[PDB]
Ligand SMILES: NC(=O)c1ccc[n+]([C@@H]2O[C@H](COP(=O)([O-])OP(=O)(O)OC[C@H]3O[C@@H](n4cnc5c(N)ncnc54)[C@H](OP(=O)(O)O)[C@@H]3O)[C@@H](O)[C@H]2O)c1
């Protein structure tokens with residue numbers, strides 16, 4: 628089905644548009660095209676530095692009577708420099724102001740790591756280490772719960788949390804709301820079998836990010852692996868008369884994941900949506916899972932000694 632049920636009773640569309648690295652000058656048109664072709668879920672974040680331009684697109688389509696607000700599923704995220712309990716509400720309200728909305732469908736803790744508060748998204752010491760903050764996941768979570776109580780967000784969740792970090796929230800004394808979603812990197816080179824099994828077993832929906840392997844990530848090398856150019860995945864696409872991107876988007880859907888491919892290119896936005904008219908076989912699924920290499924595109928070397936760095940754990 629085209630939507631998954633969350634723990635608040637809301638239905639989250641299984642396909643969403645990603646917006647990381649969508650330049651402000653191009654993203655408004657990307658969002659408008661996405662809504663026209665049928666996307667009803669947009670994945671946003673303060674750190675993407677383009678929420679105003681995403682907001683413009685949403686407002687235009689609401690005013691054109693293309694969609695009403697209740698048919699859209701808008702996700703944003705709390706950046707690392709705002710983990711302090713007293714900064715969370717302001718951060719959420721700023722995102723809401725930028726998006727020109729009065730509520731979010733889902734608001735995520737972007738990373739488990741708190742960074743020193745300030746103007747810089749990535750505060751670095753003179754040696755290039757990220758400067759942490761004196762914050763912890765449980766206290767941040769309590770501040771996230773308050774946003775639900777106040778009516779600013781319908782659901783809260785996490786992103787880039789490992790299973791122990793998820794467990795820490797689940798076992799919080801006085802927990803008010805369980806996390807609805809854990810958004811994690813997921814693709815054929817990083818299949819995340821253990822963490823997905825964990826999260827699904829705990830009734831947390833998983834969203835797969837970078838499903839095409841983020842070929843526009845800033846730290847890519849032309850030598851690095853390329854899912855969209857992997858000849859084995861091209862073969863699977865050819866067999867179904869689909870593109871490699873369509874195979875990579877359908878793959879997580881058949882694992883009961885939400886998936887959020889990014890594009891600012893209208894043709895690709897439309898292409899990427901054409902994934903509801905075919906099915907990958909059992910063999911195809913097994914084959915794509917067999918490509919796992921624990922190859923992670925989203926991490927920073929500069930964050931690896933943070934107490935809450937998520938990727939030292941096996942899962
Ligand atoms: N929670 C987190 O920490 C986190 C981390 C990473 C990502 N995310 C979310 O997940 C989203 C998706 O991940 P991502 O942006 O890293 O990368 P991605 O969706 O895996 O790949 C995006 C790249 O693929 C290209 N592309 C898109 N569709 C294509 C197609 N049909 N044919 C060929 N190329 C295609 C895009 O080009 P063009 O745009 O130029 O067309 C862009 O270069 C993000 O935008 C963000 O919303 C979250």
Ligand SMILES: O=C(O)Cc1nn(Cc2nc3cc(Cl)ccc3s2)c(=O)c2nccnc12
Nearest residue numbers: 647672674675738740925926927930936937
């Ligand atoms: O956080 C994202 O959604 C993607 C993202 N990912 N990354 C890599 C990161 N890895 C980590 C690892 C940690 Cl532990 C904390 C924050 C980050 S951000 C970036 O450097 C970055 N820079 C600007 C905007 N988006 C990003």
